[PDB]
Amino acid sequence: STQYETQGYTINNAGRRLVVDPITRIEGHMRCEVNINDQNVITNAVSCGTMFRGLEIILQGRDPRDAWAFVERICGVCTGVHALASVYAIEDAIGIKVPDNANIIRNIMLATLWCHDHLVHFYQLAGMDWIDVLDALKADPRKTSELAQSLSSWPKSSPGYFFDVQNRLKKFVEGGQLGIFRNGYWGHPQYKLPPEANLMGFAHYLEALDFQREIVKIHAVFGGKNPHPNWIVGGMPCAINIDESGAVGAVNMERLNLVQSIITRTADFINNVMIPDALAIGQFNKPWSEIGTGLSDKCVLSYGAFPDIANDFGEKSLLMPGGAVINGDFNNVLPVDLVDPQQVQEFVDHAWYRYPNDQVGRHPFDGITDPWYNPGDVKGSDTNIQQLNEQERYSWIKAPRWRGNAMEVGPLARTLIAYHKGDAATVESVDRMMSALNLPLSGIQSTLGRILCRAHEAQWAAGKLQYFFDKLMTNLKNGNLATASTEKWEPATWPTECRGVGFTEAPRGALGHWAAIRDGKIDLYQCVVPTTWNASPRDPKGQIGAYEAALMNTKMAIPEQPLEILRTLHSFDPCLACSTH
Amino acid sequence: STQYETQGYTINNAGRRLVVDPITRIEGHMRCEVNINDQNVITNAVSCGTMFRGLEIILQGRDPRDAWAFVERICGVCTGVHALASVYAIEDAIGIKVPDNANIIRNIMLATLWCHDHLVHFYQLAGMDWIDVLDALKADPRKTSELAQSLSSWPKSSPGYFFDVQNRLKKFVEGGQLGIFRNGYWGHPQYKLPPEANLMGFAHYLEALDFQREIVKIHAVFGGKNPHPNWIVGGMPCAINIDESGAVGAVNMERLNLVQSIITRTADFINNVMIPDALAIGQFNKPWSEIGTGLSDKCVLSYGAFPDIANDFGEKSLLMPGGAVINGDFNNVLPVDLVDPQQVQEFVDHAWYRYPNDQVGRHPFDGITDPWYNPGDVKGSDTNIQQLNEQERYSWIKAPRWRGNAMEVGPLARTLIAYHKGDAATVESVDRMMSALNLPLSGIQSTLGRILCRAHEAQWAAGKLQYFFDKLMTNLKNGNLATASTEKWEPATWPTECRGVGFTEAPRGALGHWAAIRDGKIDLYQCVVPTTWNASPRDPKGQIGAYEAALMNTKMAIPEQPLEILRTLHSFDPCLACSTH
Amino acid sequence: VVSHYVFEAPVRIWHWLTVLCMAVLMVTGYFIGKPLPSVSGEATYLFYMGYIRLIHFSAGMVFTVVLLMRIYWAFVGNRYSRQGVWYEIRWYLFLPIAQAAMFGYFLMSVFMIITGFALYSEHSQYAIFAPFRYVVEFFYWTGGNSMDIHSWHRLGMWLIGAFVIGHVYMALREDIMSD
Amino acid sequence: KPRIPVVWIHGLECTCCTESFIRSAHPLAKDVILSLISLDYDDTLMAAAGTQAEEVFEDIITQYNGKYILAVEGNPPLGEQGMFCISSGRPFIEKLKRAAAGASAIIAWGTCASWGCVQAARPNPTQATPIDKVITDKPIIKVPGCPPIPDVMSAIITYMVTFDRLPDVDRMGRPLMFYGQRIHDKCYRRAHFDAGEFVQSWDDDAARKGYCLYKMGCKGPTTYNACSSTRWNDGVSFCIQSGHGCLGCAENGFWDRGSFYSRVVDIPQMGTHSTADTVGLTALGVVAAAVGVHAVASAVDQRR
Amino acid sequence: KPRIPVVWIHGLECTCCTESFIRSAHPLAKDVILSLISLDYDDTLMAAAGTQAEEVFEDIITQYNGKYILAVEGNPPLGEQGMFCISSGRPFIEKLKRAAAGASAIIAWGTCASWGCVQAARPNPTQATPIDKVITDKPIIKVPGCPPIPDVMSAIITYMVTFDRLPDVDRMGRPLMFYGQRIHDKCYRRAHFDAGEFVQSWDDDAARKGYCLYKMGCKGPTTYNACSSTRWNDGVSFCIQSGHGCLGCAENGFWDRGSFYSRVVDIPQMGTHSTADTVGLTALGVVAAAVGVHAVASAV
Ligand code: HEM
Ligand code: SF4
Ligand code: SF4
Numbered sequence A, B: 001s002t003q004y005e006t007q008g009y010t011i012n013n014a015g016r017r018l019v020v021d022p023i024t025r026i027e028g029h030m031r032c033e034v035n036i037n038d039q040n041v042i043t044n045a046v047s048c049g050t051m052f053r054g055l056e057i058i059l060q061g062r063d064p065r066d067a068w069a070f071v072e073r074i075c076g077v078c079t080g081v082h083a084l085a086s087v088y089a090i091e092d093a094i095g096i097k098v099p100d101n102a103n104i105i106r107n108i109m110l111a112t113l114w115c116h117d118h119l120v121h122f123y124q125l126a127g128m129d130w131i132d133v134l135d136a137l138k139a140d141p142r143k144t145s146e147l148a149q150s151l152s153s154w155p156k157s158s159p160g161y162f163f164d165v166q167n168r169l170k171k172f173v174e175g176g177q178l179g180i181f182r183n184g185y186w187g188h189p190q191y192k193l194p195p196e197a198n199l200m201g202f203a204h205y206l207e208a209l210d211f212q213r214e215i216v217k218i219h220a221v222f223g224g225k226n227p228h229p230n231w232i233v234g235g236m237p238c239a240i241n242i243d244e245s246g247a248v249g250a251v252n253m254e255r256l257n258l259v260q261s262i263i264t265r266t267a268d269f270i271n272n273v274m275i276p277d278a279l280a281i282g283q284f285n286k287p288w289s290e291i292g293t294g295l296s297d298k299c300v301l302s303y304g305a306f307p308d309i310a311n312d313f314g315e316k317s318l319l320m321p322g323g324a325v326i327n328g329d330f331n332n333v334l335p336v337d338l339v340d341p342q343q344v345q346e347f348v349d350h351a352w353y354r355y356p357n358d359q360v361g362r363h364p365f366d367g368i369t370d371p372w373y374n375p376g377d378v379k380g381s382d383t384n385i386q387q388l389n390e391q392e393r394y395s396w397i398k399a400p401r402w403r404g405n406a407m408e409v410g411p412l413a414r415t416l417i418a419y420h421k422g423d424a425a426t427v428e429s430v431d432r433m434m435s436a437l438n439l440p441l442s443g444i445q446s447t448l449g450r451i452l453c454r455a456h457e458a459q460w461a462a463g464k465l466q467y468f469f470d471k472l473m474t475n476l477k478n479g480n481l482a483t484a485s486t487e488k489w490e491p492a493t494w495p496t497e498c499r500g501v502g503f504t505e506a507p508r509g510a511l512g513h514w515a516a517i518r519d520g521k522i523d524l525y526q527c528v529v530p531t532t533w534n535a536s537p538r539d540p541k542g543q544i545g546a547y548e549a550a551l552m553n554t555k556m557a558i559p560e561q562p563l564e565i566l567r568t569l570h571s572f573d574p575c576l577a578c579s580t581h
Numbered sequence C: 001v002v003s004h005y006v007f008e009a010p011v012r013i014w015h016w017l018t019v020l021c022m023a024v025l026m027v028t029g030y031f032i033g034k035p036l037p038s039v040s041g042e043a044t045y046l047f048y049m050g051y052i053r054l055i056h057f058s059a060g061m062v063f064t065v066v067l068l069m070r071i072y073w074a075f076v077g078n079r080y081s082r083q084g085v086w087y088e089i090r091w092y093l094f095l096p097i098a099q100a101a102m103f104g105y106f107l108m109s110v111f112m113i114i115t116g117f118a119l120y121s122e123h124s125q126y127a128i129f130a131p132f133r134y135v136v137e138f139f140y141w142t143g144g145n146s147m148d149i150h151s152w153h154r155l156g157m158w159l160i161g162a163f164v165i166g167h168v169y170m171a172l173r174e175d176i177m178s179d
Numbered sequence D: 001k002p003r004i005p006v007v008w009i010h011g012l013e014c015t016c017c018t019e020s021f022i023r024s025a026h027p028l029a030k031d032v033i034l035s036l037i038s039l040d041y042d043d044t045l046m047a048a049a050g051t052q053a054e055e056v057f058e059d060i061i062t063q064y065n066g067k068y069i070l071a072v073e074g075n076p077p078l079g080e081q082g083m084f085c086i087s088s089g090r091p092f093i094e095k096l097k098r099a100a101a102g103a104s105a106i107i108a109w110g111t112c113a114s115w116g117c118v119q120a121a122r123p124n125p126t127q128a129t130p131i132d133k134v135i136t137d138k139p140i141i142k143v144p145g146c147p148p149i150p151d152v153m154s155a156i157i158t159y160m161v162t163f164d165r166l167p168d169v170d171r172m173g174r175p176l177m178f179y180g181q182r183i184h185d186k187c188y189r190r191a192h193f194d195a196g197e198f199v200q201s202w203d204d205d206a207a208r209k210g211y212c213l214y215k216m217g218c219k220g221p222t223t224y225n226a227c228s229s230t231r232w233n234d235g236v237s238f239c240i241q242s243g244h245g246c247l248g249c250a251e252n253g254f255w256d257r258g259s260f261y262s263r264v265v266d267i268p269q270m271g272t273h274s275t276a277d278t279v280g281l282t283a284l285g286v287v288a289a290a291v292g293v294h295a296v297a298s299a300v301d302q303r304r
Numbered sequence E: 001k002p003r004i005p006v007v008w009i010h011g012l013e014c015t016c017c018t019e020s021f022i023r024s025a026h027p028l029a030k031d032v033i034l035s036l037i038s039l040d041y042d043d044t045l046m047a048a049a050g051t052q053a054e055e056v057f058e059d060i061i062t063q064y065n066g067k068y069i070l071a072v073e074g075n076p077p078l079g080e081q082g083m084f085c086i087s088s089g090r091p092f093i094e095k096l097k098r099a100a101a102g103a104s105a106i107i108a109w110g111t112c113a114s115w116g117c118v119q120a121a122r123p124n125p126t127q128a129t130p131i132d133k134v135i136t137d138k139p140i141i142k143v144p145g146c147p148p149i150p151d152v153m154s155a156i157i158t159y160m161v162t163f164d165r166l167p168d169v170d171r172m173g174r175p176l177m178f179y180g181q182r183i184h185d186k187c188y189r190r191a192h193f194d195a196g197e198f199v200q201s202w203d204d205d206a207a208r209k210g211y212c213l214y215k216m217g218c219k220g221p222t223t224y225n226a227c228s229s230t231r232w233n234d235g236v237s238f239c240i241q242s243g244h245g246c247l248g249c250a251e252n253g254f255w256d257r258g259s260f261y262s263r264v265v266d267i268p269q270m271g272t273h274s275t276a277d278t279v280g281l282t283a284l285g286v287v288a289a290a291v292g293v294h295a296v297a298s299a300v
């Protein structure tokens, strides 16, 4: 066993080794390994992505206009963000400029993905970390009613309602078929919700799992379907007809009416079910505002997203601000450039890939996706990893670094970047949120902080949905209808040789697509996805990723039951197929 | 002014004359006139239908297979019942016999119409007679919450919820644009609901006006659309395909799933919103169990409906029993026959029609629809009726009589007939309903009785929906798929000359279609509709219809504000385009 | 069956029918794949793509039946029946080969029939066409969709065109040289 | 901030249009009434009856003269001095005329107000005449159908409120958005009609696969609506999807264009597969008689 | 009274199928899980992780051996000894085989499990292979689509539970109900197609009137699904209605069948690109020059 210092942390692989494989209630395949000491405190964390498909390899020689379709299928959870990132990049390459409505629509697609994705995470994925499902059976419905009513103006709150929910669950469990709750962690001393809050939570879990499906109808309108909607280089396929013959063949007043109604319902739901539940989880699990800080008080990153001036990815346009903080200096929010080779780099000295020189970092335009599985002395075999070898290669996830710095991306990062940039909206949203919890600003830089921001972001996104819709309608009122540019749709008209960058904020963090074209064909296509940042292995200098960082110094109550581990991990919203692609 | 006795009543047209034209919150066009004495008690009532279109005349000489489509458009409120009555009759005439599923589906269509029609009436039409909308603005939301929760396990009951509802109404009214509540009757001393019940009521009014739309999706599946779904002589067009290639072109497992989900939601809604509100309107407006009795304790009629054995309209099959009671003798429930000329008759000596002899009554197979507007000395003119002349002709509604007896039809009638026939289900539903209100059995024979029964009937119908669904599914399970018979679809195969009777219970009462065929053409088609029974003018013997009867002896608090009149009338659920056709 | 009975003409009347169907098949067939410029307004009353589709399908019939019996005659009139030796006939005939254009032509049109009817019968007419449902099952085993049948069918057209270019020269080479 | 005043009258009607309007899924009927317009008079929903209802009517048409929208559902009869439809003791046509003269524009809801619908079918006993034949000095938007599609009604309303203008119309008076194209041209079963694949009698093998209803007298080929595209009741289904041919219920005098169950005159029909099939069997038959003499099989299929 | 046990595993996947399944409107995803089946194992939703999740798996496949349904989403990689997808420290293919052998029947969800989907498109770096190429002793229902229609997934489920039998399949393993007819067969824009009325370029006058997307490379003509009939997301829309051509995302190897915007597409056996036209026109010009050489050989 060896020991070294990095980023203010003491990484020590001596002491009992715990293995969490497979990580559940995440997207895709993750393996997590740790070391604990005599005080049951994590002194080493190992973040391994246990899947790979190779989109970067597949994309080569393809018609760039076909690319969005391929890379959308990177992830079904964050469905659509990759397509957006694609079209963005191909347009950056060819030099295509889309019509206003195309943008306004795309922004709607993204705001929709945020609202839906965040909601499903909070309940279906992360929820059970905090809500002791089986403890709901010991709740008094009348007090559950009284509680929900004290926190929220949400209509569904009758004592009879919570009683049916309780009984249905009692029916479910009564047969010995716990299903998804089977061999869970219920009764762990870190579950801190009272009987009544547990039932309130679980009822909301089911309501959410019902409502989620309706949000995506917005995708179904513009995109055609969800999961995996459709897009084009040049704008959007979903031509609009409002008062001419054959509006039945297009986006029309009725279709727009559908969208409108889902916006209202989505906003209302998030604001009155998720938002209050987030604050309530904050209330009862308060000490978690100091556990799982990780990189969030050192290095955070945002590219920026939601360009409100069409085809202007500049600062004066992106409604969700970009920027980076390093070394915990939040007073100086540095500008990020995706073209600059001394900024975004990817080291693979600890990943299962092959480079000419594996000690240097490659900027995505120089990216090399050459898979090479090679785990080394893992004390087992190649077909049986009992214990990963973190000294060498140990993940299918490449290690990206902003200027060599290990970064955290995602909702929490977006919030700190936005806050310290001076964003009028965000300074009022965070200050009131933390004041409501009687916690200081720093309380936000935590495992609890991550959940709280995500919920805030869904609220923001749903707000923004209505804003975008309105923008679209004002254009329609004002005779502006165009949805696509076709001037450069033909390959004959593209530069013989060119390249471009596609960037946005996916629900999980900062997303970039770097693409290169040669003779109407994809020459190179490289992807750097949010969870690739967060779940990142170590680099040459031994620096740790956002994940391994947030797990360090975390106290475990029961070592064989890794709830404390799951809590911290899920709060980042892991998406492995995204991270590995 | 003249005075005479009839059916235990003293009809006196001396004293102040009151005119309610047009009657609102009903279907179509009605004029009501009354006389009051010194004690402000109704001593004369006049029931006039102020519209006519003439379906019976139009139908003549058309293909009997086209008839359902024409007569369905008799009424858009009770949409579909007339089509059902039609197919029934053409099949009775030709001798057709439909496959089991066709029936099970048709019964579904009807149960659906019952659920929907009753619901919309209770809230959108009749509701405002009992619920003082503007008084909701003086309600305390917290107590409104506490009240709703005491009455019902319905989820939507949070104090915040009733507050938003109140505020939205306050916003609505605040502008001076009362809209539909404009110049209403609010603050009348017969409004007996407390502030909190008024808000609870109005919130349900809106929830109902929202939910009602979803019920008819069941029609949309099988019928294609609602209003005015599609049917065929021989069964139903909606061919079923469950497991074979091209199930996408038919009623399939997904479609049946949709229906299923609507059934569940409709049942749940009626049981937890309408049913409780009905009982609650019963609680606070209790003295109305003795006002507006009318014919309901003398003569009541049902034809029967919902044949569970396919093509068997016998007693051992109709799930909703038939029968008639006369002279208040409910121990002897007489069998009804629609073929028998000494049973159902139609006198027009007080209607705007022409007969060879206008003193006799014609059974529908001898029916004559010859319109002849002739009001007589109305003290005004032909184009300006200031006061109808009830001594002569005064309505577009024919006067039907069962064996010369003036009958009441509809939900209250169906209930007494069902009850006194010994129906195990109905004796338990009524006894518990009246016991819950601490009212005797006779309390049901009233304006309040009428509302209560309607609500009970929707509950019954929604229960029966699930029953019919299950039946259809059991057939599908058991490889029974046929939805239509086609042997006698060709006119070449019909009897050269034949006749038939179609009968069922529409939401408002007893419906009959008498049809005659000659050389593949409609020779005669006569209709006797529920509201034609209820809103019936007088006959040669001066006997009064169900309406005019229920209005007699009713005390009015304010004469110029005819709430007492509207309450009694709406409780019958008037449908004038139905009554006149 | 809408008509009945003809009798039969001289045999060259069946060659000309082929070439005509052949040509008609090619034109129409080309525009199934690369369709003409879009037309406009009120679809009920116009049906262009459908006719160039209809003519194609029925030309196919006339073609298939003309060819099935054109072959039925060729090898019953032959009396040559009714690997080892095919690698010995090409080794003394190297020590004018347009008879390998008869075999090439023959096989190409047969290939076209099989591929085309795999596509035409796939709205499962269920009738006699069940054999052609193996053809689809094949192409899936191959690697992919029924789409490939289109791609390969179209390929057949060009390859057939190649044999025409190789015929009509070979033809007009001797029609011109009339010494 | 104030909502736009709407007056909604009813003549001879079945009330299927008011029934339809309230079926609207987006925006909700509720939300239209509380937020989008001020429905100031509607016999079917309003609290006031009798001389109270008379008073609201008079007050609204007076105070908002020149400023309000007139919705009309159903139509006026002309026979028997118009007394086939009496309103407040006087012919309906009088209430219509007084409401019309005060309105800025008129929506004619359904086939009744647009064309005449059922009350106006042979022999038309009441002499029902459409609104455009009685009111000739105002703009009238005809939104036909028995009924029109709820979401279309509401959508038309939202267009008018959002865009503050009347929808574009064909020469007929129908909004172009939903009435610009025939049912037959956005029919999901066109594929079958194109092939020559028809339902021949109800519940036959054809009908089970959702083949074309053309031969069951579907009249979609001559009916302008949006049912095949927008569809009924929150996009659940429509006439044709549910197995019945289009009756053409959005088209003038459709009640009188023969039976609902017969063909449809002067629509070009020529089957892709049907014709090719006949060509093949017609050619096979030629060779069959010329060489063989017809086919007496034994397996009839054999391929397994 | 007891619900039927379901085990749900994931190989190399994007998770679009589990996302789709939960979009189900009727019956509700929720109601499926609480009332119709006992979803006993699903990495994406279950409480247990790590050696707890390992324990549920082992426990369920043991106690319900021969009795449970195996849902599989995504596919197994064969390259690098199968470690392109590691599960509990071992290749995924081992978890699949061990769950398959214990199952009574297998539902292959989406194009991934049915055909191979994206991970298996050229050059196929992980050697992703479909379930039917790895598990050959069990009944496998292929429900393709990237993803399949939510209400179709659920509907197939309800069919199997209500009728207590496997749906009937085409000679390819797909349930007949929703995969018996092509998109082009029940396309609402068919009227335009046969008419000759096509979108030529995006947002053009044609596109606004909702003309046929054939010329924009729609693959509906060769794609068996139910999107034109059943439609996506509670019958809201589908690819074609929303202005894009069918990609053919329910069809075997559709990723490799030329461009999506192309009619006349990549024949993968002809290599790099070479389409029907390309190879045909290559041959045409070959014989066109072979004519030039014998005509130049006319030494009369
Ligand atoms: C040598 C004669 C033939 C030629 C030149 C020919 C040519 C073509 C071509 C070029 C296509 C376009 C495919 C594409 O580009 O996607 C096509 C499609 C087609 N062909 Fe042929 N073909 C021939 C024989 C046949 C036969 C015998 C049949 C039998 C019915 C047939 C039936 C079809 C069908 C069903 C299609 C697809 C139509 C659609 O997509 O709706 N072909 N043909
Ligand atoms: S059913 Fe009617 S509208 Fe549909 S394709 Fe057939 S003929 Fe056209
Ligand atoms: S869009 Fe595609 S599936 Fe639809 S009609 Fe056109 S070619 Fe056929």
Ligand code: FCO
Binding pocket: A075, A078, A081, A082, A506, A507, A508, A509, A511, A529, A530, A531, A532, A575, A578, A579
């Ligand atoms: N959000 C999301 Fe998916 C990840 N990580 C992407 O991009």
Ligand SMILES: [Cl-]
Binding pocket: A241, A242, A243, A247, A251, A252, A253, A254, D177
């Ligand atoms: Cl529109």
Ligand code: NI
Binding pocket: B027, B074, B075, B076, B077, B078, B079, B575, B577, B578
């Ligand atoms: Ni009615």
